[PDB]
Amino acid sequence: LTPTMMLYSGRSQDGSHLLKSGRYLQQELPVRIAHRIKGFRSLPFIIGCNPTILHVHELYIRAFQKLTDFPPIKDQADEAQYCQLVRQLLDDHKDVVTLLAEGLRESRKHIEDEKLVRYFLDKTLTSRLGIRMLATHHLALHEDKPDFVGIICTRLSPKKIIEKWVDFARRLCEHKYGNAPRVRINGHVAARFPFIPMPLDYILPELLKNAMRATMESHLDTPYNVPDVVITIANNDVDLIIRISDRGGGIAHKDLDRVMDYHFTTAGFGFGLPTSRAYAEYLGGSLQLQSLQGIGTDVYLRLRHIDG
Amino acid sequence: LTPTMMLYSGRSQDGSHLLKSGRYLQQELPVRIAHRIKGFRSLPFIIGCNPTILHVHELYIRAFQKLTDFPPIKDQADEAQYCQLVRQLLDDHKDVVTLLAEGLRESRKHIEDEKLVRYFLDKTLTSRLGIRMLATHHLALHEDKPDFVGIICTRLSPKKIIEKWVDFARRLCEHKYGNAPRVRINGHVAARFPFIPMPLDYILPELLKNAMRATMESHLDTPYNVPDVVITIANNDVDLIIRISDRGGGIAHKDLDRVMDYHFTTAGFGFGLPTSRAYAEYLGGSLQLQSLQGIGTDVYLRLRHIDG
Ligand SMILES: Nc1ncnc2c1ncn2[C@@H]1O[C@H](COP(=O)(O)OP(=O)(O)NP(=O)(O)O)[C@@H](O)[C@H]1O
Ligand SMILES: Nc1ncnc2c1ncn2[C@@H]1O[C@H](COP(=O)(O)OP(=O)(O)NP(=O)(O)O)[C@@H](O)[C@H]1O
Ligand SMILES: O=C(O)c1sc2cc(Cl)ccc2c1Cl
Ligand SMILES: O=C(O)c1sc2cc(Cl)ccc2c1Cl
Ligand SMILES: [K+]
Ligand SMILES: [K+]
Ligand SMILES: [Mg+2]
Ligand SMILES: [Mg+2]
């Protein structure tokens, strides 16, 4: 399970579990979308009037309308059709974070209470992550991947998922700087446990891009020889901790209180940190930074284990 | 002086004080209007979209535009023209409280944070009172009323101003119920001191209408014989206290925590109490209620004396 939300791990011969899942989505999602719509309605007028914000607002209204218009799920035939609608919405909404970032960038300056946008984005993006997890889980329940029940991996290796995103971030970095730091992984490298990869897929690349940009930008004289990023995995009975340590010079004192703000960037829109922290906390975890100004940064991602 | 705002009591032979006053308004008002416009811009979208709210928003923008368009005041000729604009705006904006009450009535239900409207109305209505006091003072500086310097009365009798509003409220009450309670005034009935009547003119009739409605509605069997409203004046070196005591049955326990809310009424829009308290507090005073459920209510208006 996740916040106020359960991921059904049930399997059934008749496929009755797909019906149960679909029915669950149909009770759960419209309410959650409705809350987000209320969120748009309460946005400060000048932000709510932004055409890009209006577009997302309308997308959410349209999502609510489609889900509520969909008939009661009675049989596998209905459920199959329902999955089509779910796939459509997941796709129609795939650029929502980008749209919000864009619509909010200028318009948020025109209000006074800056805490407002932070609260709206935290609440909206985390609710969205939840919606997407539930929807994607339902679709995945049709899949027959070994080691998966829906989007729940029954034997996730943190080392493997880290390596996947390391390769991804190194590719981006190499394309931009001609090189990329190597990454060493230590600690509980052999750990394997039930876990939902999705949040890691969101968070890991954000933290890795940060460490790599910082490293390259602080070693412009020696792009061909930069210090490794070092990642430590700690697996215990309560949580999983992933520490990502760079020698990229640190987060400057004058920036430290701003890096967690949406839209703050020293370079994207500056969303990597605030989004990652919101997601971690939403899931019962945390994201903490330790800056060694002049040397580098240690970033600690903590995520709670799945309860059985 | 009043909050962050000074009422110029200067008199001058050449009339140079009118120039100084006008110039002061021209520096002060646009900023204050601008802050109120920012207030409209930050209203929750769904409220800001209300056509009546939009109308007031536009009125404020138009007021800002006109003041800022008006040329620098150089001579009595300019100042005379300026007074025309001031009179126009005072008049164009005379129904603003009513418009806000109307535009907010339904739309405020659609947001979550109810504290929001209270804060907006408190801030907007008090800023408005300040704007109107300054504008009206400037115009009044042209007048030659004995005992007045602008809107500042140099020898206000609280008994006299109370009697003025007593007659007014009794007329309304009599028209509605066929009778009205008599009002007795005691305490410092002979008090006279420098004071700005304007806030009393706003507040006194609101509190008197309340006491009289309560009295009539609790004595439906004997409309021709209802208990007096009793008003006590206490004048000291710090403040003026006006206690208005009725035998109208009290404010019920179930209503007590709601009577200070805008839009709450057991019957207007339900604005008398929250507006009166906002105004009192804005001026450094207070408005406090003591309910004797089953008997009546004591309402205490406190306003600070003018500093010399
Ligand atoms: N490991 C790090 N070392 C040094 N600076 C960092 C590090 N991580 C983050 N920062 C700084 O923190 C700022 C904000 O990070 P972030 O929120 O992830 O936005 P961004 O990287 O600038 N753009 P985005 O692609 O949206 O994430 C960066 O721009 C940097 O100034
Ligand atoms: N002296 C009183 N005795 C009994 N009830 C009172 C008294 N004063 C106020 N109330 C109650 O408080 C409520 C709100 O008062 P108020 O804010 O002044 O709005 P209102 O009188 O209902 N309408 P309005 O014309 O806008 O002022 C009233 O409707 C009554 O229920
Ligand atoms: O905003 C989003 O990303 C999504 S995906 C998604 C999928 C469904 Cl089935 C319903 C709403 C919804 C929203 Cl809102
Ligand atoms: O809202 C109001 O009542 C008023 S009276 C008024 C008079 C002037 Cl001169 C300027 C703005 C202004 C406003 Cl805003
Ligand atoms: K940021
Ligand atoms: K009220
Ligand atoms: Mg980033
Ligand atoms: Mg009233």
UniProtKB/Swiss-Prot annotation, chains A, B:
Function comment: Serine/threonine-protein kinase component of macronutrients metabolism. Forms a functional kinase and phosphatase pair with PPM1K, serving as a metabolic regulatory node that coordinates branched-chain amino acids (BCAAs) with glucose and lipid metabolism via two distinct phosphoprotein targets: mitochondrial BCKDHA subunit of the branched-chain alpha-ketoacid dehydrogenase (BCKDH) complex and cytosolic ACLY, a lipogenic enzyme of Krebs cycle.
Record-given protein name: Branched-chain alpha-ketoacid dehydrogenase kinase
Shown stretch of the complete protein: 70 to 405 of 412
Positions of the Histidine kinase domain: 90-307
Listed GO MF terms: [3-methyl-2-oxobutanoate dehydrogenase (acetyl-transferring)] kinase activity; ATP binding; protein kinase activity; protein serine kinase activity; protein serine/threonine kinase activity; protein serine/threonine phosphatase activity; pyruvate dehydrogenase (acetyl-transferring) kinase activity
Catalytic activity: L-seryl-[3-methyl-2-oxobutanoate dehydrogenase] + ATP = O-phospho-L-seryl-[3-methyl-2-oxobutanoate dehydrogenase] + ADP + H(+); L-seryl-[protein] + ATP = O-phospho-L-seryl-[protein] + ADP + H(+)
Keywords annotated in UniProt: Acetylation, ATP-binding, Kinase, Mitochondrion, Nucleotide-binding, Phosphoprotein, Transferase, Transit peptide
Modified residues (N6-acetyllysine): K123, K164
Family: Belongs to the PDK/BCKDK protein kinase family.
GO cellular component: mitochondrial matrix; mitochondrion; oxoglutarate dehydrogenase complex
GO biological process, one term: regulation of acetyl-CoA biosynthetic process from pyruvate
E.C. no: 2.7.11.1, 2.7.11.4
Organism of provenance: Rattus norvegicus (Rat)
Subcellular location, record wording: Mitochondrion matrix; Mitochondrion
Residues that, per the record, bind ATP: N210, D246, T265, T266, G270, L273
Bridged cysteine pairs (disulfide): none
Regulation of its function: The ATP-ase activity is up-regulated by potassium and rubidium ions but not by sodium ions. Up-regulated in the presence of apo- or lipoylated-DBT/E2b subunit of the BCKDH complex.
Assembly and binders: Homodimer. Homotetramer. Dimerizes through interaction of two opposing nucleotide-binding domains. Interacts with E2 component of the branched-chain alpha-ketoacid dehydrogenase (BCKDH) complex. Competes with BCKDK for binding to the E2 component; this interaction is modulated by branched-chain alpha-keto acids. At steady state, BCKDH holoenzyme contains BCKDK and BCKDHA is phosphorylated. In response to high levels of branched-chain alpha-keto acids, the inhibitory BCKDK is replaced by activating PPM1K leading to BCKDHA dephosphorylation and BCAA degradation.
Tissue: Expressed in heart and liver.
PTM (free text): Autophosphorylated.
Chain sites annotated for binding K(+): V259, D261, F264, G270
Source superkingdom: Eukaryota
Sites where the protein binds Mg(2+): N210
